[PDB]
Short mmCIF file of C-alpha atoms in Angstrom, two decimals:
data_model
loop_
_atom_site.label_atom_id
_atom_site.label_comp_id
_atom_site.label_asym_id
_atom_site.label_seq_id
_atom_site.Cartn_x
_atom_site.Cartn_y
_atom_site.Cartn_z
CA UNK N 1 -161.16 -138.11 48.09
CA UNK N 2 -158.65 -137.59 51.19
CA UNK N 3 -160.64 -135.33 53.20
CA UNK N 4 -159.98 -136.78 56.69
CA UNK N 5 -156.44 -137.21 55.53
CA UNK N 6 -156.24 -133.61 55.00
CA UNK N 7 -156.90 -132.84 58.54
CA UNK N 8 -154.78 -135.78 59.25
CA UNK N 9 -151.65 -135.14 57.37
CA UNK N 10 -151.93 -131.82 59.70
CA UNK N 11 -151.40 -134.05 62.62
CA UNK N 12 -148.87 -135.60 60.58
CA UNK N 13 -147.28 -132.35 59.93
CA UNK N 14 -147.19 -131.84 63.75
CA UNK N 15 -145.84 -135.21 64.16
CA UNK N 16 -148.28 -137.69 63.94
CA UNK N 17 -147.99 -140.56 66.45
CA UNK N 18 -145.58 -138.48 68.24
CA UNK N 19 -147.07 -135.03 68.18
CA UNK N 20 -149.16 -135.66 71.41
CA UNK N 21 -152.64 -136.36 69.50
CA UNK N 22 -153.74 -139.38 67.80
CA UNK N 23 -155.07 -139.14 64.12
CA UNK N 24 -157.95 -137.45 63.01
CA UNK N 25 -158.54 -139.40 60.02
#
């Protein structure tokens, strides 16, 4: 159950490890 990933992939959608933030999940 990818709960964190959902909040994560959002980070990913932003740019992930190149978005400004570090990952949530």
